[PDB]
Point group: C4
Chain length 388, copies 4
């Protein structure tokens, strides 16, 4: 076949419809469902699948004790069929490690997993299910990457990595891969001051990534990548509609080229679709914790430091736990435009529910509609009391 | 490949033979079998599969408590191989929601799932396993559809939807899809006074649907659809052999253009094959509850308001629980005629068996034979005492 | 592709080597393994699979209680990959019923399942996984068939059926199918006096079946079928090496055209390879019960009523339970000859082990070698005490 | 397709990166994971898979009691997807027996399994998933083979077998197969004095095998095979870096043509990559038991009896249990060189952990990198206390 090229724009987003939901924690109460976290979704030309980092144990298994921890030798990137749960028997391992990204270039899939101790981690780049390239840590402090899908154009797939402090200046690099081979890498440029866990999408030969500032910012950094020139810029979302978590209350003036202050040394992976008047931002409803999730239509959020919402949709009630969120699109669907999609990780267990000793999640996913559809809310749906 | 066209008539039906049976509740006593209800069967050109609405839990799982309820965020349309049970590990999710239909047009499969709260539900139309179109509620009162397979002709697949009261006049629409796109919709016309859960089949370029009148009728409404003109008519089955449940005893004169009275605000999904002297009707044996199932040969049942049975076959004894029933056919089989098939849902658990706190079902399915075959009876076969 | 034709002879049989073994009862002690009985093996052009009649429950499931019974609505013909156990999650249902046969003609597979009450049973013939023909009971007394694979030549697949008494004269028919359609049937001719559960193989355009005389005989009946003329003959194995079970001790003169007396109203499915000086017979070691299994090389056993063994191989020790046995061959293997194969059913549970309330089996299978290989013995290997 | 030919050399090995890990014992604490031992890895042109000898029971099953034993009728060679665990539901049986090897020749896979009692064992050779040839024991004392993958060149696949004493001179043969047929065999020649469990790889039309001397040696024997001439030589690794287990401490002079003494009648399967200055040896860290695992870069280890390490990498800490290790490569990967890979068996249970009554393992696997990557350590990760 052929390399996918980003020739289309985004479809007009007037609401969001349910796309996938795996009910993993409900089902895992009485089935062999793997403990996971950091999920995402990624499409092949002939299939869309769920992805996540396994913890190498089932939820009901005794080894689920202690799975609040992020990095171990027992983690792996797995994938499984859309809206099924991640089971021992239906999950496919993509590579071994505790930080990942993955994407299809139209011909084959690239998957990247990072493993190792904090001071000696390394990335292995797989292409067509074979290891092709390796990258050693350059700052010796938890080499880490996107935790959602990358995007490819004409065979070139950019990936954002960070190595260094989670609470001060770090060393972020953008790598450009083709068939798993390193074409080029560059150090981060622009005005973003701290970058983690970028969520990306592609449109009209440009790639846009919305990231997490874990140091001083509660507005989100944005990286804009030209996959042909293999260059990038960075800044923050200018809008005063702040979308990190935890975060201050929304002001009336945002910040384009610096972190908006109030909350230090924390954050959550999130995403946005930045498309002029067709702009939608995702965020937790709570400003204090990872609970609730909503989409807000915020015209020109990227560039207008006074911009406010004109429409919205609740995805997860504030009474229910959320978690990481990220972007993906089916680049191989029919039609003249790409349909914006996203997922929300619904974290259950520790630290917020400490009557159990495990941490896991389920997944809900939505795609955009040109209709103005009615909204529901989409909780994980499991009862903690059943696990006691 | 090519779009299927409805070029054949029905085979002569002289008896029914066993086609499929999944023994799901028996097997689920000690395996990871999903709780379901509203099952059906649908064929692809190369495979026939079972379908149902999952409840997002296994039977032995503690989340099975409360599954008598019809609409939740944890339901999804799943499919799995013919006569296997619906397990966590072998079930494929088609889309998310609590009311569905699905059919193959010869090239790809269309699946439709409705989700949302009662006053804000929406349908998402999937084609070739991608979302293609969306339809918002128009009466804000449980938008709902067939719960068995649709039928396609030359790429055009009609689907019947209802939105509005279950106990008074409602707003029924027939939608005509092609490759998941809306070609046209029309409001219900004809003399049917209330329409729910249509069971359809196709023959000689016409589609016939047998539905449920939940308001005042215990005779079944019939919709006849011309998929080329994209028009329809409606009436009731004229025969005094009444086939809803619950229902009055059979009179000697039926009603062609109005509900036959006696039982209000209830019913069950059912089906018929209306083919002149080759006409067969399905119904529960009990007039009071969903127990037993039988087929009756009732010549010209559609148009003769004096017609009575001349032959029959018991499928499920009155001593055993039944449930929904519906039609399907293998439009891709060999031969000069289409073989009529049907399924019966065998409901176990609540409300009729309240020693357990769950509701689920298994499936039995039959197809027609030109032979005069001996009959058996086909119970679910599970013992409730084992689940206590 | 093309219809297989029987153009080769049997390979020289100098010993037997292990082919497959599924350890089903061992594994089912702690996994979701279906209760089965009446297993066999059958090859497709690209795969060989195990087959059996499921009982619609797992071994550890509470519905395993009572599975000594042979005929129920919860039985089905299933198949699963060679040497795996029959699990809920890996088994494919071929058709519904409690007596079966199945074979591949080179293009597609035909499967036949019989279901119904004792006085009203019927066979459904499936071809390319669709129902094609049906056959009603003709003697109203447990219509029944081979319980191992049929054999095809140039698209024509003969199958032996019996309807009527298990303890007196019955009505046996040979049906000739092509693409699931009935070409012809004939009533049994020749000198066999009672026929059940034929085990067949094909070579040089002839099909040979070794059957079970359940009435008066402890020598086995043989049916020889010409699939081109669609005619047959029948007799008994002439050898005094008797191979039914239970049976008298071996005399020095056998019987060619009548039952050898001593044991009435019982038997077991078995097989032989009748090939002049290359003749091998299978039998239980015990004359009283289904325990042990051995192969004996008995030159001209079919026609020589004085013939005795000149070589042998123990398959299952007399200290271990056996059961049904039958023939199959890979008609699509490389080489100038067909390699003779067989399976032995290893029955565990009731009636011989009544500390449990279930009956199931595992499978061992062997194929012939031109080498003189060392022998092992191949028990089921499960410990009944573990199931208590 | 075409037979693979060994046209490439080894890639430069500057470090090792994680390739696969199945966490089988962790996951098997609460899932239907088969008990195994003697694992390995082998690639097809389109897939790489894990292999092992099953014990015909799950870990949590009661039949796991006694699985320290090596040879039983319930063992089989199974394969399953890379980095998944070996489950009842995802494992494919290749053949039946208790000693094995397997390899793909570019067109189809050959698998060999040995079964039988100690004095009457036999090998069955499968090709394209059909039995093709058989080999009877020639010394009547546990006929046995490699327990890791063989290597093919232009359709010819050499395999090393041993029959005879484990504690004195034995009869080793090299067999040369093509499409499962025996082309030739030869008796072992050269200076190796005892050969078991060879680990092989291929490069530039030569095959190199590193074996186990179980009699008097703690240096490893090496067999070098010319698959075109179908001839071989043998010797020992000359280096004083000793790599058997148990073993003496490293001297300063090794032995090229005789066993290095100190430890009798024991050993462990292991491997090396012998490639001049690109030479790397694997070994346990402990000299006394199967604990820890490390790679050492030992230039010209094969031929230099003074050679010492100049670089290394720890794979498994000495505090953690290891086991067998072996070589494999993806002969169908892209690039101008073959990437060296290996696996380490991580044995859990008896004899070292006798609070449980079973013996099983998990797998870790690495491949070489031209980068100098940071190292981690890779334990099995299961807690024995959870199994009590
Ligand atoms: C069936 O389903 C449908 C479809 O889902 C349901 O309809 C949906 O209903 C929801 C809920 O109401 C709507 O979401 C909200 O949308 C509003 C925005 O819409 C309003 O404002 C628009 C802009 O108005 C301004 O500009 C125009 C210029 O043209 C000017 O005219 C106007 O005066 C004003 O200057 C209006 O255009 C718009 O009107 C239109 O739409 C109406 C329908 O909604 C319609 O009736 C009209 O005729 C017209 O067509 C409308 O008035 C969002 O503002 C809102 O989001 C805020 O509120 C939620 C809480 O509900 C909160 O979670 C959000 O985060 C946000 O509030 C926070 O952020 C603000 C920005 O900083 C801040 O100002 C707030 O104080 C608040 O901040 C606090 O909370 C946050 C979060 O914790 C925290 O971080 C902060 O620090 C701080 O603590 C909702 O998104 C959908 O748009 C609507 N969809 C459709 C298609 O109608 C329907 O209800 C369902 N039916 C039933 C029966 O259930
Ligand atoms: C082996 O297997 C075979 C194959 O399955 C078995 O054979 C089958 O046996 C079953 C059971 O008997 C049969 O089903 C019944 O069929 C009859 C219809 O057939 C009869 O009537 C025909 C029509 O007669 C009328 O017209 C002709 C004009 O030509 C005229 O001559 C005649 O005088 C009369 O005017 C006859 O043609 C037919 O004869 C033929 O067939 C005979 C074999 O059956 C054969 O012997 C003859 O020689 C001839 O060839 C035959 O007489 C159905 O009426 C019946 O269904 C009613 O009864 C069941 C209870 O059994 C009930 O559940 C049904 O719902 C229905 O009864 C309700 O509805 C009626 C309609 O409103 C109503 O009038 C009733 O009062 C009753 O209503 C009550 O109950 C319902 C349900 O709860 C409730 O809703 C109401 O409100 C009310 O409370 C059966 O379907 C098969 O047809 C037959 N198949 C074959 C191929 O033979 C065989 O038995 C097995 N063997 C063994 C050993 O087990
Ligand atoms: C490693 O593995 C190898 C390979 O598996 C093992 O070698 C195998 O060993 C087994 C066990 O011994 C052998 O099976 C037996 O074979 C004999 C037949 O072979 C003997 O007889 C041949 C025929 O002799 C006659 O004809 C020739 C004419 O040429 C004439 O010369 C001769 O005098 C006589 O007239 C001989 O040719 C043959 O010799 C050859 O082979 C020898 C090796 O075996 C070799 O040493 C010689 O040099 C020569 O090459 C040999 O003498 C079968 O008879 C026997 O089966 C009977 O016995 C078993 C019990 O063991 C029983 O279960 C069978 O059912 C059968 O006995 C019953 O049926 C008879 C027939 O009616 C009846 O007469 C009996 O009384 C008995 O009946 C009772 O029991 C049954 C069953 O319950 C019941 O139904 C009845 O009613 C009644 O109660 C075995 O099959 C293999 O052939 C042999 N294979 C090879 C390749 O060598 C080796 O042992 C292993 N190594 C180790 C260390 O373990
Ligand atoms: C992040 O990750 C990176 C990458 O993994 C980590 O860096 C790695 O660190 C490990 C651990 O230190 C290294 O492994 C060791 O390598 C040494 C070999 O390297 C040394 O020696 C080289 C050769 O020196 C000789 O020749 C040169 C000629 O050119 C001459 O100049 C020199 O004087 C001497 O004559 C040196 O070239 C080399 O220097 C280079 O590398 C340095 C970095 O390592 C660098 O700083 C230098 O500038 C230069 O570039 C270096 O000095 C192995 O010797 C060693 O293996 C031994 O020790 C381990 C224990 O640690 C033991 O398990 C091994 O089995 C082995 O020791 C046994 O065997 C010996 C051979 O018989 C014997 O002599 C020993 O006594 C011992 O024997 C006992 O134990 C065994 C086992 O139980 C038993 O069987 C015996 O009987 C007996 O009881 C390690 O393999 C990696 O090479 C290194 N990799 C890289 C790329 O740097 C980094 O640490 C991580 N970072 C953090 C923060 O964690
Ligand atoms: C490689 C790694 O440890 N990633 C972890 C990151 C980093 O800690 C932060 O991004 C700070 O760098 O955040 C999590 O803890 C979190 O917030 O839920 C989860 C994730 O596993
Ligand atoms: C969308 C929805 O709720 N469908 C439900 C329907 C409606 O209640 C009725 O058709 C009245 O409209 O009927 C059921 O309750 C029933 O009778 O078993 C099941 C089904 O799930
Ligand atoms: C259709 C049917 O019932 N087949 C059964 C047959 C018949 O009873 C006999 O062949 C007599 O006809 O034999 C069995 O009981 C048996 O011997 O183990 C098993 C089998 O299920
Ligand atoms: Ca932050
Ligand atoms: Ca009604
Ligand atoms: Ca008999
Ligand atoms: Ca040794």
């Amino acid at each position: 076949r052929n390399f996918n090229n980003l020739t289309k724009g985004l479809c007009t987003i007037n609401s969001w419809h349910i796309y996938g939901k795996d009910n993993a924690v409900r089902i895992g109460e009485s089935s062999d469902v793997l403990v996971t976290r950091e999920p995402y979704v990624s499409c092949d030309p002939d299939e869309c699948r769920f992805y996540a980092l396994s913890q190498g144990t089932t939820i009901r298994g005794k080894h689920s004790n202690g799975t609040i921890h992020d990095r171990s030798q027992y983690r792996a990137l797995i994938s499984w069929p859309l809206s099924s749960p991640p089971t021992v028997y239906n999950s496919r391992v993509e590579c071994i490690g505790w930080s990942s990204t993955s994407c299809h270039d139209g011909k084959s899939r690239m998957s990247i997993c990072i493993s190792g101790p904090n001071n000696n981690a390394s990335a292995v780049v797989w292409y067509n299910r074979r290891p092709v390239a390796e990258i050693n840590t350059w700052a010796r402090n938890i080499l880490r990457t996107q935790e959602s899908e990358c995007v490819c154009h004409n065979g070139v797939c950019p990936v954002v990595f960070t190595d260094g402090s989670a609470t001060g200046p770090a060393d972020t690099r953008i790598y450009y891969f083709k068939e798993g081979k390193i074409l080029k890498w560059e150090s981060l440029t622009g005005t973003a001051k701290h970058i983690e866990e970028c969520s990306c999408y592609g449109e009209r030969t440009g790639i846009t990534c919305t990231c997490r500032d874990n140091w001083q910012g509660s507005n989100r950094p944005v990286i804009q990548i030209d996959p042909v020139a293999m260059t990038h810029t960075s800044q923050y979302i200018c809008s005063p509609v702040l979308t990190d978590n935890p975060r201050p209350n929304d002001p009336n003036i945002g910040k384009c080229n610096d972190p908006y202050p109030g909350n230090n040394n924390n954050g959550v992976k999130g995403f946005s679709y930045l498309d002029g008047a067709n702009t939608w931002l995702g965020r937790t409803i709570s400003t204090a914790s990872r609970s609730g999730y909503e989409m807000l239509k915020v015209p020109n959020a990227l560039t207008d430091d006074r911009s406010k919402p004109i429409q919205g949709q609740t995805i997860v009630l504030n009474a229910d736990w959320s978690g990481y969120s990220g972007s993906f699109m089916d680049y191989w669907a029919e039609g003249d435009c790409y349909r914006a999609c996203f997922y929300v990780e619904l974290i259950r267990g520790r630290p917020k529910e400490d009557k159990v000793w495990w941490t896991s999640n389920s997944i809900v996913s939505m795609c955009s509609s040109t209709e103005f559809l009615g909204q529901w809310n989409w909780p994980d749906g499991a009862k903690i009391e059943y696990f006691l």
